[PDB]
Amino acid sequence: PFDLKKDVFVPDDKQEFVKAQVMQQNPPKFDKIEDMAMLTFLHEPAVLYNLKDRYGSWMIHTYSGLFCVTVNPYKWLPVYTPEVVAAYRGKKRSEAPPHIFSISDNAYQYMLTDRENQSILITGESGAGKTVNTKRVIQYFAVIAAIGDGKGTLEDQIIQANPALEAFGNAKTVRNDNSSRFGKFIRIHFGATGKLASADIETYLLEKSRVIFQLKAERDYHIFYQILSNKKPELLDMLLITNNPYDYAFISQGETTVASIDDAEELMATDNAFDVLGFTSEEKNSMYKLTGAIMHFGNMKFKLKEQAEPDGTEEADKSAYLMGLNSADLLKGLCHPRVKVGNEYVTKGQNVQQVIYATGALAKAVYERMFNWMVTRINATLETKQPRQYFIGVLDIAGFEIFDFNSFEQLCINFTNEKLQQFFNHHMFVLEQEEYKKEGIEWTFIDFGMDLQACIDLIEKPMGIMSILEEECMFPKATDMTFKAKLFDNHLGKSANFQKPRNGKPEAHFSLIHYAGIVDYNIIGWLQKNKDPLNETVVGLYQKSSLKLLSTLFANYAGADQTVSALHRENLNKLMTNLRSTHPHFVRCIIPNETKSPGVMDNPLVMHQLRCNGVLEGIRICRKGFPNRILYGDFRQRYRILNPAIDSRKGAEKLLSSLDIDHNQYKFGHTKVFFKAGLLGLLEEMRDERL
Numbered sequence: 001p002f003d004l005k006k007d008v009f010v011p012d013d014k015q016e017f018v019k020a021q022v023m024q025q026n027p028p029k030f031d032k033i034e035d036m037a038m039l040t041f042l043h044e045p046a047v048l049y050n051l052k053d054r055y056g057s058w059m060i061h062t063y064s065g066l067f068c069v070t071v072n073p074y075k076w077l078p079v080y081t082p083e084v085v086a087a088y089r090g091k092k093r094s095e096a097p098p099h100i101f102s103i104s105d106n107a108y109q110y111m112l113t114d115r116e117n118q119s120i121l122i123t124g125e126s127g128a129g130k131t132v133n134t135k136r137v138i139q140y141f142a143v144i145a146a147i148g149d150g151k152g153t154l155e156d157q158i159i160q161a162n163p164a165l166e167a168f169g170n171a172k173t174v175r176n177d178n179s180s181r182f183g184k185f186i187r188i189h190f191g192a193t194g195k196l197a198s199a200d201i202e203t204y205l206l207e208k209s210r211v212i213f214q215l216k217a218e219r220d221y222h223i224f225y226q227i228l229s230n231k232k233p234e235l236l237d238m239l240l241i242t243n244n245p246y247d248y249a250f251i252s253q254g255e256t257t258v259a260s261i262d263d264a265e266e267l268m269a270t271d272n273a274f275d276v277l278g279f280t281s282e283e284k285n286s287m288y289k290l291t292g293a294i295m296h297f298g299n300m301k302f303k304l305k306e307q308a309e310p311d312g313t314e315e316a317d318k319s320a321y322l323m324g325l326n327s328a329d330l331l332k333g334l335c336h337p338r339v340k341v342g343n344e345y346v347t348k349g350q351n352v353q354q355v356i357y358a359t360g361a362l363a364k365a366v367y368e369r370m371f372n373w374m375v376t377r378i379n380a381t382l383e384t385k386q387p388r389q390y391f392i393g394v395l396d397i398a399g400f401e402i403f404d405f406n407s408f409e410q411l412c413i414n415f416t417n418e419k420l421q422q423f424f425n426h427h428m429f430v431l432e433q434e435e436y437k438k439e440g441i442e443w444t445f446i447d448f449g450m451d452l453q454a455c456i457d458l459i460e461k462p463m464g465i466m467s468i469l470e471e472e473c474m475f476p477k478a479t480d481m482t483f484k485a486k487l488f489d490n491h492l493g494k495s496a497n498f499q500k501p502r503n504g505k506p507e508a509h510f511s512l513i514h515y516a517g518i519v520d521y522n523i524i525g526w527l528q529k530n531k532d533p534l535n536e537t538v539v540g541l542y543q544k545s546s547l548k549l550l551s552t553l554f555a556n557y558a559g560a561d562q563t564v565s566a567l568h569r570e571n572l573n574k575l576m577t578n579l580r581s582t583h584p585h586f587v588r589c590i591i592p593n594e595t596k597s598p599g600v601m602d603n604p605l606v607m608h609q610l611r612c613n614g615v616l617e618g619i620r621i622c623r624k625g626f627p628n629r630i631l632y633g634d635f636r637q638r639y640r641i642l643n644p645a646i647d648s649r650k651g652a653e654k655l656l657s658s659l660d661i662d663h664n665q666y667k668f669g670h671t672k673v674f675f676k677a678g679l680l681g682l683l684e685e686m687r688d689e690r691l
């Protein structure tokens with residue numbers, strides 16, 4: 001039943017809103033609507049209850065005008081079958097239920113239609129569902145390619161690239177058991193005619209610190225635990241290691257086992273991927289050897305000879321062989337590093353703290369450089385040298401996160417999420433309205449309040465958090481307190497998004513009002529994390545190493561004779577300019593609850609996400625504007641059938657007036673007919689009714 005004026009939504013204190021500041025409920029005709037732009041009433045609880053209702057029937061995808069919202073089901077669903085893949089092909093958005101397969105197919109459709117590169121941009125916080133959705137886009141394209149009209153086919157290698165990468169670059173955190181600890185942009189290349197030709201991956205900022213450090217409730221990278229599972233006892237013999245994670249300090253500061261992850265079957269999936277990817281046994285064992293060496297490296301003790309000297313060579317010995325190095329040379333490089341004196345050298349001295357730091361850095365450097373090499377190797381086999389014309393890029397970044405302890409790592413992560421949200425804002429609100437102005441459409445610019453420019457400027461612009469951190473690095477006398485002091489002198493009271501920390505729970509130094517909330521940051525060791533300096537004496541031995549992998553990992557290295565933040569900003573800007581030259585397809589992932597409960601929806605958490613993403617705003621610009629527009633030529637070429645009674649424009653004017661449609665549903669532009677929501681669908685439907 002229904003009551004047009006009595007059925008309303010009231011602001012609940014614990015559940016955001018509740019079925020009954022009074023908003024009208026939508027009629028039952030619109031229950032579980034596939035496109036929320038077609039709801040008669042549009043307010044916060046209207047969108048919240050349509051999403052909650054669809055999620056109750058396990059319908060995790062839902063359209064919001066031109067973009068899609070997916071809510072993590074936390075449970076496998078039978079909607080990603082190859083049968084469903086084949087059915088989604090060729091289908092228009094309006095003639096199939098919302099799905100990630102529809103976003104992918106329609107990006108493909110626009111690519112060949114417009115002769116334009118596309119990009120599937122997936123947003124969301126930690127554990128929202130970004131990586132799963134990214135894998136389903138690649139899965140759709142590979143399955144579609146593999147059906148047409150040792151090392152495996154291009155399609156299998158593309159799929160198997162991700163399990164190989166997740167072992168080395170993904171890890172369990174407090175918010176996600178398989179959190180991506182690096183950004184990823186994947187391009188799927190096609191020829192002029194649409195046949196899949198090639199693929200490449202570009203990875204961004206792997207969280208180095210995780211390799212040698214873990215928080216109370218989190219693990220190191222999956223790979224360590226997979227190896228220590230003993231599902232391949234041969235690997236333990238090869239790496240000269242025990243079967244206990246608690247025997248290795250670098251990998252056991254936090255948790256060591258995850259309930260949702262079977263580390264034994266995962267190592268099998270990991271190894272199988274390297275096989276399909278074309279890797280060799282020497283290649284696999286070299287990466288396994290290096291992973292092992294990094295564990296032994298962390299177990300080396302030191303002592304006062306203020307100068308350090310090895311406290312027992314047992315752990316040093318094991319890692320030196322796995323690396324193809326001399327154990328005495330390795331230890332003398334750590335404790336007594338060479339300093340250039342023209343064509344000669346003098347060693348400097350180090351204390352136990354200085355050697356411990358140097359060792360930590362070297363393991364992080366080896367690990368990150370191993371991941372880079374691995375990505376390059378995957379790229380080398382994905383390179384088919386077949387003719388390519390276009391590409392469909394997929395962006396899977398590390399999601400917005402807030403831990404009990406937030407450091408440099410969290411700042412770089414959250415910065416990117418703020419940057420990508422601004423991409424959505426600029427595309428959906430600024431560029432869209434400039435297109436109406438361009439085509440002489442009657443329109444007055446709307447301010448949707450979607451502009452995190454102040455927060456982005458605070459982080460990246462000169463004298464901002466990152467610019468201050470870069471300048472303070474290039475001062476040898478600079479300390480964490482001088483950086484803290486510089487941040488506050490320039491920004492306290494001046495930058496609105498920079499606040500004093502809101503402190504049991506670890507001590508924070510400053511607050512940052514991000515698009516998705518206030519994040520408390522601890523600036524300890526940020527100067528060192530940004531510098532990333534290495535013991536060049538040990539790096540020198542690495543260059544000469546008898547293990548080809550370790551030698552090539554460090555062959556391209558520049559000595560003493562650039563920072564993390566400068567490189568991150570450089571890559572982020574390069575990425576945003578390159579995405580600007582594509583047709584973007586936004587997928588907004590929503591985490592339904594903190595506790596990983598499938599089918600359960602926390603209303604205050606979902607509504608927070610929908611607000612900071614701009615879902616209501618993005619729906620309104622679709623309703624108030626004109627989301628569909630066809631060139632007068634492309635309109636006569638397809639819709640002349642409707643009424644065949646010389647100019648492309650004048651003919652379209654007479655055609656639309658001769659039809660039984662609302663004459664307010666369309667507007668005439670300089671080169672295109674701009675349609676209101678749903679009118680295009682009705683015109684396409686009418687084309688079948690006389691085809």
Ligand SMILES: Nc1ncnc2c1ncn2[C@@H]1O[C@H](COP(=O)(O)OP(=O)(O)O)[C@@H](O)[C@H]1O
Nearest residue numbers: 074075076126127128129130131132176178399
């Ligand atoms: N569509 C989905 N179907 C089933 N489970 C999902 C889906 N998307 C995500 N999950 C679950 O949620 C976890 C976290 O999602 P993930 O894609 O890794 O998040 P993010 O990359 O945004 O941090 C996954 O490991 C998986 O267990």
Ligand code: VO4
Nearest residue numbers: 126127179180399
């Ligand atoms: O958990 V994430 O993969 O979004 O970092």
Ligand SMILES: [Mg+2]
Nearest residue numbers: 130131179180
């Ligand atoms: Mg991820």
